[PDB]
Amino acid sequence: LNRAKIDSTTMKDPRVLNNLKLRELLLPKFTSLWEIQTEVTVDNRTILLTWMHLLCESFELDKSVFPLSVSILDRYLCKKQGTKKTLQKIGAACVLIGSKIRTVKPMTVSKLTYLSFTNLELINQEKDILEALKWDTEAVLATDFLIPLCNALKIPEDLWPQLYEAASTTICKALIQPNIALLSPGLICAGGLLTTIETDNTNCRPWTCYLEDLSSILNFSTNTVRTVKDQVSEAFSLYDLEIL
C-alpha cells in the first residue's frame, strides 16, 4: 500500500546519476539483437514482449518489473537457445524473476501457468535462467534514469508524480519494439521524457529547451538525442494487442 516518496539521497545526489551512467557501462554491447538464435526471430520477440507487457500492466506491477524482465530475457538469450515452442515459458519465467526483484507482491507460478506447461516446468525454467546468468539478474533500467534526469534538468519537484507516471508508461511500451533494445538505458529514458513533455506540455517548458541539456547531462550529441526522442515516440505508436 505505501509508495516510495522523494528521497534526496537517492534522487537529488548528483553522483547517483553518475553511478547510473557508470553501471550502465557494465551490461553487454548489443550490436545484433538475438543473433545467437537459430529458430526464434525478432518478430517472435515483439509478440512475447507484448504479452509480458500486458501481464505486468494487467496485474498492476511496479513500473520497473517489465524493463528488468526484458533485460533478463535478452541476456538469457545470449547464452542458452530458445525454440518457438518454448519461448513463452522463457518469457514467463523472466517476469517471474523480475517481479520477484522489483515489486512488493511477486507474480506466482500458479498464475503464470494457468494463464499461459506445469509448475515444475516453470520452476525448472527459473532455475535454468538463473544459473546460466550466474545469478547476475539486476541491471540499469531505462526506467531508473527518470527522476535523476528530472532533477538534473532542474524541473521543480512538484511535477514528478505526473511526469514519472506518463514517462514510465511511455518507456515501458517502447521497449516492446526491436530497435529499442540496442539503445543505452539513459538514452531510452531521455527520449521517453522528451516525448512526454511534448504531448501535454502542461505548465512545463517546450521539449526544445531540454535537448541541449540532456546532451550535456548524458554526454551524447544533440543529434543522437533528437533521434532517440523520435525513436521512442515511434516505438510507442507501434503498440498493438491485435498482434498476439
Binding site: 516510495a4 516518496k5 539521497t9 532455475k127 545469478w135 539478474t137 539486476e138
Partner: protein
C-alpha cells in the same frame, strides 16, 4: 559428503569451511531451504545475490563478498549453498567478548566510520540495506567492517510499493513503526542505534511490541512538535549513553532524529566533526 569444500555449525544454516580449489583457504557457506512445489527460488535470496553481484566490480572494502551459488538438485529438493568470504566475527559476539572498559573509543570511531561508508556506497547506487543490526555487521581481525545479509535490500525507485515490515523491532525506525513511507533514512536509524549499542554494549530501544517499541523511542528522542509529525503517548541522551564524547552526541542525535526528512545522511555524517580526529 561435502562437495569442493570441507564442512557441527556456526549459526537455512551457516557453516565454516575450507576450499580445495584454493591453497586450503576459508569460506562461509550459507545453506538455504527451498520448499518443494512453491514459488521457485526464494524471493529473499534472489534479491540478496543480485545486489552483491551487481556491485562486485566496485570491489568495495566495507561490503561482504559473494563467490558462488550451488543450486544442486527425482527425490531430492533444491539445495542452495552460497559461498562467501569468511569473516571471523560479527559485531554482537565482538561486543560481548571485548575485555573490560569495553571497546576503545578509537575503535568506536573508525568502525562507525567504516559502517557509514558502507552505507554511503549503497545509497549512492540506490540500494537500501533495510536490515542493519549488530548480527549483520561483520568485523575482520584487522578491525574491519563488513555489511552482510542483503535478503531485504532492493533498488529504490520513486512511487514503488513497500511492505510495512522491515528491520528487527529493536532497530526499526519510527517511520516504519508508524506505518508510513520509508527510504534510506531507515539505515541511519540503525546506525544511530548501533552507535549507541557500541558505547553502552547494550541495545538502546528494546521492546516486546511495536507500540511498546515506539514508546521507548519517544522516551529519549522526545515527543517532537506537529510540524515534524506526518494525541497519544526527553532526558538528554547522555543518561543512557555515558562515556560518549560531546561531538559524538551530536552525530548520535542527528541519526536518531524523528522526522525522516531531517535526519542525517551517510554522506554528510562522514564529514561530521566527530570523525575529524581520525587516523589516515
Amino acid at each position: 559428503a561435502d562437495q569442493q569444500y570441507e564442512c557441527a555449525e556456526i549459526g537455512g544454516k551457516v557453516f565454516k569451511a575450507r576450499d580445495l580449489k584454493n591453497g586450503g583457504r576459508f569460506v562461509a557457506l550459507k545453506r538455504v531451504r527451498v520448499q518443494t512445489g512453491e514459488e521457485g527460488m526464494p524471493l529473499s535470496t534472489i534479491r540478496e545475490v543480485a545486489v552483491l553481484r551487481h556491485l562486485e566490480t566496485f570491489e568495495h572494502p566495507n561490503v561482504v563478498r559473494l563467490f558462488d551459488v550451488c543450486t544442486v538438485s527425482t527425490d531430492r529438493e533444491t539445495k542452495l549453498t552460497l559461498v562467501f568470504e569468511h569473516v571471523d566475527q560479527d559485531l554482537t559476539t565482538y561486543l560481548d567478548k571485548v575485555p573490560e572498559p569495553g571497546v576503545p573509543t578509537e575503535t568506536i570511531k573508525d568502525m562507525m566510520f567504516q559502517l557509514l561508508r558502507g552505507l554511503d556506497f549503497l545509497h549512492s547506487h540506490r540500494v537500501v540495506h533495510r536490515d542493519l543490526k549488530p548480527q549483520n555487521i561483520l568485523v575482520t581481525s584487522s578491525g574491519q567492517i563488513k555489511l552482510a545479509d542483503f535478503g531485504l535490500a532492493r533498488i529504490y525507485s520513486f512511487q514503488m510499493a513497500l511492505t510495512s515490515v522491515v528491520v528487527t523491532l529493536w532497530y526499526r525506525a519510527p517511520e516504519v513503526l508508524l506505518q508510513s513511507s520509508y527510504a534510506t533514512p531507515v539505515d541511519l536509524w540503525s546506525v544511530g542505534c548501533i552507535f549507541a549499542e557500541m558505547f553502552r554494549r547494550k541495545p538502546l530501544f528494546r521492546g516486546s511490541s511495536d507500540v511498546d517499541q515506539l514508546g521507548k523511542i519517544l522516551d529519549v528522542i522526545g515527543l517532537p512538535g506537529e510540524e515534524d509529525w506526518p494525541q497519544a503517548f526527553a532526558q538528554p541522551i547522555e543518561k543512557f549513553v555515558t562515556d560518549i564524547d560531546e561531538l559524538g552526541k551530536d552525530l548520535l542525535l542527528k541519526c536518531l532524529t524523528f522526522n525522516p526528512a531531517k535526519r542525517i545522511s551517510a554522506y554528510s555524517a562522514l564529514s561530521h566533526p566527530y570523525f575529524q580526529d581520525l587516523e589516515r
